[PDB]
Symmetry: C6
Subunit: 304 residues, 6 copies
């Protein structure tokens, strides 16, 4: 909805956003939203995501598709009215994204999703990219395990010429919706095939906000390697504007750079990561700050 502010309320909002990243217990936001989703009336639509055609499919709290739901409205705080209607398995009325309120007045946050190796990591979408020899696939799985901490991480596989890989976009959005509804740490291996249909465009522009709203993190690999300034600019834009965080390789093999948006209007943080391989390509991230916009663009150049 829209929000109204004066100097006081705005300063309070910023303090609260700062806290959502810097001081809140890691993963607490996810726990809170899990509670909100579970308190929902059975059969109530909680998430709508766009399929390839641009239409949207809707899911309930248990990640089951809602095929028929008769028009139902809800008047919000600002007076606006929210409407949701599902017919023949497709949203007739409503919008893409969370269909129930998880944040409230607390918007524009990058809820700390986890802490690892002395660094806090944000929820939302993390795009892993860059050129060079450092491998991306091993990196997303290592990050997924690290941020997962005590919990297992969920893996969504898409568009690779390997066994068992789904290559259908509509099955892909279904897997992603189920993942965000049920797990805090999510790995997506290969955003490459989405990179374009309407559903693919909706996904790039929606996923970061969906995840951040949920308090979960979606770690997605994205290879720039494609000397086609049409697609490459799309890769840089997705990394610059649709990603909550960015993990990009450097000049040194095994070394990565993490750029994190800490919240609405807040500064971006940066830290380095060292890694090494064990058996069967299993990667390990070794354990034992503020960066300017000009610097951000410098890193974006790496993908050219």
């Amino acid at each position: 909805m829209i929000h109204l502010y004066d100097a006081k309320s705005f300063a309070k909002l910023r303090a609260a956003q700062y806290a959502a990243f810097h001081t809140d217990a890691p993963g607490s936001w996810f726990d809170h939203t899990s509670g909100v989703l579970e308190s929902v009336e059975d059969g109530t639509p909680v998430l709508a995501i766009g399929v390839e055609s641009g239409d949207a499919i809707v899911f309930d709290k248990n990640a089951q598709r809602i095929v028929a739901y008769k028009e139902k409205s809800v008047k919000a705080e600002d007076g606006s009215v929210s409407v949701v209607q599902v017919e023949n398995g497709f949203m007739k009325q409503g919008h893409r994204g969370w269909l129930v309120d998880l944040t409230g007045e607390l918007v524009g946050c990058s809820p700390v999703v986890a802490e690892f190796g002395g660094h806090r990591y944000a929820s939302g979408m993390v795009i892993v990219t860059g050129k060079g020899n450092s491998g991306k696939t091993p990196l997303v799985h290592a990050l997924g395990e690290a941020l997962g901490g005590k919990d297992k991480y969920a893996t969504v596989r898409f568009g690779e010429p390997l066994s068992g890989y789904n290559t259908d976009f509509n099955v892909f959005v279904d897997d992603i919706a189920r993942a965000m509804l049920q797990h805090r740490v999510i790995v997506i291996d290969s955003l490459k095939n989405v990179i374009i249909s309407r559903g693919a465009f909706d996904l790039l522009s929606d996923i970061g906000a969906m995840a951040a709203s949920r308090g979960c993190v979606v770690i997605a690999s994205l290879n720039p390697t494609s000397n086609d300034d049409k697609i490459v600019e799309l890769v840089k834009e997705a990394s610059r504007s649709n990603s909550t965080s960015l993990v990009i390789s450097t000049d040194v093999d095994g070394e990565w750079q993490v750029l994190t948006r800490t919240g609405e209007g807040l500064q971006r943080l940066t830290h380095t990561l060292q890694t090494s391989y064990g058996e069967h390509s299993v990667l390990t991230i070794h354990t034992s700050q503020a960066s300017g916009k000009a610097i951000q663009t410098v890193i974006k150049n790496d993908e050219l």
Copy 2:
């Protein structure tokens, strides 16, 4: 409608436009249009804005969507007829923009929306953009609060990978419409995802006139950063021709330039702004002229 002029009536119009910016009490035009809107018959369509498809949704004076409204025509002064009809939630007949006359013979103005730090600011659309390290989001919020003065400013959030952000264009136009119908100072954070669907194109070409006619100001951030002459040129066209005023970053961190169109055929004014950050990135604009077209083009080069 169309207007007829001779030397005398034209000179009077120009003096009137001049005054609407230079001498009228700040925000007085907004108060005037609030009165016109509130005098409208209940349930009467007052504003129509385009959704993604290119269709238009309609609202009444209370920012409530009109789903059904049988044909109804009104003959204007120039003999032209206006017909409005709404069926199944969409305009069957009518046009985009204000459906009731808010201006009358007083057209081509940039009604002063507020005065701050010794400068007069125009209503209509203000694009906040530029390259470099100066933060845009912090600036739009500080401008909102500064021009809001005694009033709270309205915040419309769109397309950012942060918690609680809507990324659905149709929810976006609904927010914008409600905001212009109810508040004098509006901040839109991220016009980035609009910059393209028919609805997006309608939005860019309509919002400036819509706001200027209401006497409200829409402060929208737009990032150029995207070395793609296709989009970058679209950013310059939007800053050049679709904005009533432009606020753009300088070579010096924290310093901004304000370029204001003061009226139809009138000269553009320019002044500088110094800013500084307080706690949690809350930005403060410190307190304590004419510019030719060539100069304007020089400033536009900055975005390359």
Copy 3:
């Protein structure tokens, strides 16, 4: 229709076209077509202009839209047949342009619309453009008042982020149609938003011929400023091929060049204009010639 000629009849036509610009009394053609229009049977469709979709809307001699008109044919001189039919507000049969014959055998003219400061001006479409500091809006209004002479000029406002400005193309073409049906001197401020839908394309290729046939002049501002060879070439083509006359700014501030097509197969004339500003930006054109195709292309280069 088609016309047949031999050496004798062709020479007579050329002498008549020459006269229509060089010796006829200024504005007499407009008076003559006003008489043809008023002598039309009530309810008879006289003008059809394309809306955004490419469809056309029809008007009668009083600039009132005709929503229903059953099929009706008329056989011309060359034996051809003209058929007009309007259903549900849209032309079902017919063509865009004047639906009644305003010219007869007298075609290919640039009927003198007015005389000012010692120069004859042609009816039809005049594009006011160029780069540099000389302001276009002030010029089109000054030209409208100068060619208006004893009569008031009509102003069609379109696509500018100022108060009371319509930004809807279908309202715009209704405004234009009504203007040409009722006034000899018309000003269009901002052809920028048309410069693309089918209707926009129809407007650019139709308006010059419609106005010249009527004997009215349409003075339109068109800013080239937009380093995008796709649109800039479109601006040059509209100036070169869809304009009866061209008014373009020069190296010297306040100075303008007028390039006039005097008739079919005739030479283009050129003269200069000096201007100055008074109060509230009211511009005054000071008072007290054949140009080749190469010279013409030279002036077109100015817009790059």
Copy 4:
């Protein structure tokens, strides 16, 4: 239809084609086809041309549109079957072009349309183009009068911002069909607006063959002037491949070059023309050979 040949029959075909241009009486082919068209059963479809949408309209020998014609087939010599059906004013079955046989076994000719100043001119389409100061409009009218000889020439006007000019493509194809059905010499002033819709593409590719089949000549002006390699290549292709003859200006003012395709597989002829102006821009062509492909391309370069 398809034709079968052996060395003898082929040598005879070539001799006959050579004759159609070099020795037949000028205009005799047109006279013969006029006879064939007049011998046609009343109401029989004789010509189909494509309107803007790509659909085709059909005309009878008197240039009147056939709105309803029930399916009717005719088996040709090679055994193929020709079908023509018209419903609601549009061709349901059939093809674009002449619907009755005018040539027979005599195909691939450039029937001499006229002789003037010691040169034979071909029927089909003649495109008049080039850069520089030599005027095209005066040239097409002078050529039309010259080739017309004892007969008047027909003028089809399209897309110029002058009085009486039709700017509707569908009215344009109607004018052209009527012209080819009734006159040997045809002038088309401004092919510029066709230069793109399906109907416009069909016209460029069909007109030359229609005219040559009829024995009439269509003299069309085409300005290249438009530094847009997309359109300019289209101008060069139309001049190179859809024109039976080409008349292009040279370095010397008033001087033109005529390049004529004399038939299927025959050599292209070339000759120069000197011209001068009299009163009111009436041009006169003064009175008192084989060119290679490489040379042809050299002239095509002139338009860049």
Copy 5:
């Protein structure tokens, strides 16, 4: 259908393909397929070719169009099923190409179509192209007569601004279909207008296999001359990949190079041709080897 191989059966296939070009009596494959076609049930669909829209029309063994044919399936050797159905003149079910098996296990051949001047020529499609002064039209006709030998060659005319030329794509595919069903040697003058609609794209990708399967040869002229890397690259792709053989002009007037694909996986052969003109441009090809891929690419450069 699909075929299975082991070392033995593969070696036998290759010896068979080798012989189909090198040792079989010239034109014997055409005679063989004529027999297969004539043994087909009356009214049975044998060939389907795509019209402009992308739809396909169907013919029987006598080159007569089938407008109605109820579903009918046929199980092939590999267990695959072929279903053909024609409704309202268009294929409802089936595929483009030969609808009856003309080859069997003998696939991937370039059946020798004729022997002339000591050289063997392949069936399938032959593109005659190149830059320079050597005439293409005269050459395609002389090749047609030379390879026709004792038989007349068939001529399909398309898209030339000359008398009696069809310019309708759907009439074109009808001619081509009839020609391949009834004659061994076919000449298509001007593939220029195809080089783009779905039908045109289908034609370029289908004709070569269609002809090679029939044992007939299609000799088509294609002019590169069009400095537009978009189309020119399309000409090279057509000469490179869609043609069974290529005949291209040299630096020397009258001299041509023939590049022939002799079979699936077999080497390409090359030989030169000297020609001279007789009366009325009738060209005569005078009478009295392996080439690597790099050489081939060198020849393709000629078209730039």
Copy 6:
């Protein structure tokens, strides 16, 4: 479906993927999936592949198309639900790819398909490409026979101007589906015509995963030769991202490089091949390693 992992289960997965290529018996995965397929209920849809339009066709375990199959759902392990429904020959509900689970938890593998000349080859899609004189058709057939080993290889022929070659995309995908359902080693000659419709796009992004899941290998020829950075980049992307393995020619004639993806997150292997020709162009691959991402991109440059 989605899979969850912790450090332990992830390491087990990687060890299993490693084994699936490095130590499993060659071809065992194919035998295992053949067993899963044959144990399926009769009439059960097992494979869906997209036709040209983007629609999908369905096949049962015997490679016979299913034209009608009423809605039927199956709930997986992650709680997801798979729904298949076929109506009028087309999938109404379901996804493209394998419709039955061939992999289970064992995903992300490149199942060893065969061992030859001391090297293990991966199933999935292998693209054979490169520039230069080394012939591709001879290579794909030699590779098919070598990996076939004791078994015959299946050949799918598509889009070549040779006898018996299908050129219809819908027949092509039916051929491919039948091949993967019945044979371990498949050769596709000429992927050129797919390199674009929705179905072509679906094929490139689906085939690798379909084949790898099955344990079969699809060896396809793809010629880069086409100096059009639009298609060339598409060729590089298909080689880089849609190929399980790549076989590309080098500087030395007859010599080839094999680049193999060994599994999800695993390293790419590389080895060289020497070949020579025998009679009738029958090629023989002579008998008697980790490569970095940078080295990979280097080989991709070869195709420019």
